[PDB]
């Protein structure tokens, strides 16, 4: 039942708008060009016709726009009115335009919080997508009840640069999981002994592997940050081998991804300096 | 529910934790290995050692083989071929396709019925129920050993066709390996120094696993597409993975982070976005590697 208001109605902020409006806040929006909000005002929206309108209408303001050149055209002329409110801006951008922003925010008044959503319009306001918010904790720990509506909220943090880089590393996670999958689908449905087997039949297994190869993230992230890395029953030189294995493996099954001779490359510069010994969490040190 | 009579061959680091596994769920386990002298601490656990494969295999309807290689593994049984009539052979021996498919056949050629699998763990993780075995041919011996192979870890029947487990075997580990090299990059760019930098390794792992959920629901979402041959990229297209891609090659140039995983993305979905694809989903990249 809360106030919140939404500054852009843009796809993903039309979702932020209606998300709020299906948990029961009291929703105002706004958008540069008229004629996006009848569905959401007809969803229980009280739609303004001017930003100034609608940053007065609640003391939370969700920003949703194409750019951060784009929400300082919008808010700067605003800024004596943003003294004692909360800022939650949901645009994408780089980690200086979120720190940029958030120094701006800071000299007048406003409580600042970067954030980065993980999914796509269609995603939000649905379990366990994620959204994640930088800066403020005021602001986190004063509005998290209300950004639930959006999606699971995760405070990275103080610096409000944080979501922004954030984005950028899982991306690269989920494109290394999504090749490393798509390379498994194209060995699993080749000709061959224990080939012809579906994408769908993989992934069921995949799928259960999976929780299994987060257990390994979770073992490894305490090497990289005490810059240890015990092998134990996983070296190197057991990754490098059993690599090898898989390269020759989809060469022989006409698979041609490029992952096996980037694994093998890394993991050999590792071998070659001694660390054969070691956990996978060694490699930090030779992409770094 | 009522303990079985199990026989390991190979007392390696995974053969003898095979064989304690079986112990610690009360199986009257026998024991063999080529070299004497390593089944010490199974005996003290109550497992018998006999001295020779012969009367290892003949002390158990079911024989569970964990060898260096299929070479060995024909070493061993090819002199028993007369004694394995009428047992279950469990072969979770790594190795290729076509060596699987040919001990299945000789084994079936001599009344055995054969299962062969493939260990997702290493010797510490045999015994606890969250790691999985995979395995793959015999149904039957699956259904009337499936109470037994539970001693070891998760089982999981892969299908009829003995080759089965070892392609699984390489494709999961690629799949580890993509996403354990993701995950590197990305404990790389957050330790870097710069703005919104200088986050541990543990810190972004504690996001990573919870994004890893949503990550799996793409994974789900794009099989049907490549098991349909049609791809549709709704609101995430090509178009928009190249367009971050390339943010993530800028992003990791700037702060020092090479991996050559940028450029291994950005070059796939380059060529299927030149092919006219770049409205489709991820999945039409199976294309432009198969
Ligand atoms: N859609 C996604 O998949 C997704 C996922 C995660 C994050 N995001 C981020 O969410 C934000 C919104 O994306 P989107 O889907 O809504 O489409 P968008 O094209 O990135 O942004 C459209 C919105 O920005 C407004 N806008 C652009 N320039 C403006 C300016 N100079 N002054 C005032 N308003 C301006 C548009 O107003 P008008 O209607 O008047 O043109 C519209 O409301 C982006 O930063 C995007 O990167 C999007
Ligand atoms: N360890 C792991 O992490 C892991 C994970 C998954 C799968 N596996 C698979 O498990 C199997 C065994 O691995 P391991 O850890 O036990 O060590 P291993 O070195 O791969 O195999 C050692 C065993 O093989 C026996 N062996 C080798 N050559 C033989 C021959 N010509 N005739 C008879 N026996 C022979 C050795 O007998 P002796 O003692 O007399 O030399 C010993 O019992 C391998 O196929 C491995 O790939 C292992
Ligand atoms: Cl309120
Ligand atoms: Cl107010
Ligand atoms: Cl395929
Ligand atoms: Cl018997
Ligand atoms: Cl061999």
Redesign the pocket.
């Known amino acids: 039942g809360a106030k919140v208001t939404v500054?852009?109605?843009?796809?993903?902020?039309?979702a932020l708008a209606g998300a709020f409006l299906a948990a029961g806040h009291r929703t105002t929006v706004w958008?540069?060009?008229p004629g996006?909000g009848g569905s959401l005002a007809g969803e229980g929206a009280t739609e303004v016709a001017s930003a100034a309108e609608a940053v007065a209408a609640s003391p939370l303001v969700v920003v949703?726009?194409?750019?951060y050149?784009?929400v300082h055209?919008?808010l700067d002329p605003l800024a004596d009115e943003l003294a004692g409110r909360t800022v939650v801006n949901?645009?994408?951008?780089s980690p200086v335009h979120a720190r940029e922003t958030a120094n701006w925010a800071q000299q007048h008044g406003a409580e600042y919080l970067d954030g980065?959503?993980?999914?796509?319009?269609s995603g939000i306001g649905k379990p366990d997508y994620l959204l994640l918010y930088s800066g403020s904790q005021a602001a986190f720990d004063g509005s998290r009840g209300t950004l639930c509506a959006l999606g699971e909220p995760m405070n990275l943090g103080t610096d409000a640069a944080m979501a922004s880089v954030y984005d950028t590393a899982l991306l690269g996670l989920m494109w290394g999981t999504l090749t490393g999958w798509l390379h498994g689908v194209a060995l699993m449905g080749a000709d061959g002994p224990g080939g012809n087997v579906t994408a769908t039949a993989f992934t069921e297994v995949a799928n259960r592997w999976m929780k299994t190869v987060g257990v390994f993230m979770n073992t490894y992230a305490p090497h990289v940050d005490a810059g240890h890395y015990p092998g134990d029953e996983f070296t190197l030189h057991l990754h490098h081998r059993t690599m090898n294995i898989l390269a020759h493996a989809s060469e022989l099954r006409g698979v041609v991804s490029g992952l096996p001779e980037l694994l093998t490359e890394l993991t050999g510069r590792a071998i070659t300096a001694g660390h054969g010994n070691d956990s996978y969490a060694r490699l930090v040190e030779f992409i770094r």
């Open positions: 500054l852009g109605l843009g796809p993903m902020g039309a958008n540069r060009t996006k949703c726009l194409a750019t050149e784009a055209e919008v949901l645009t994408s951008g980065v959503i993980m999914t796509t319009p």
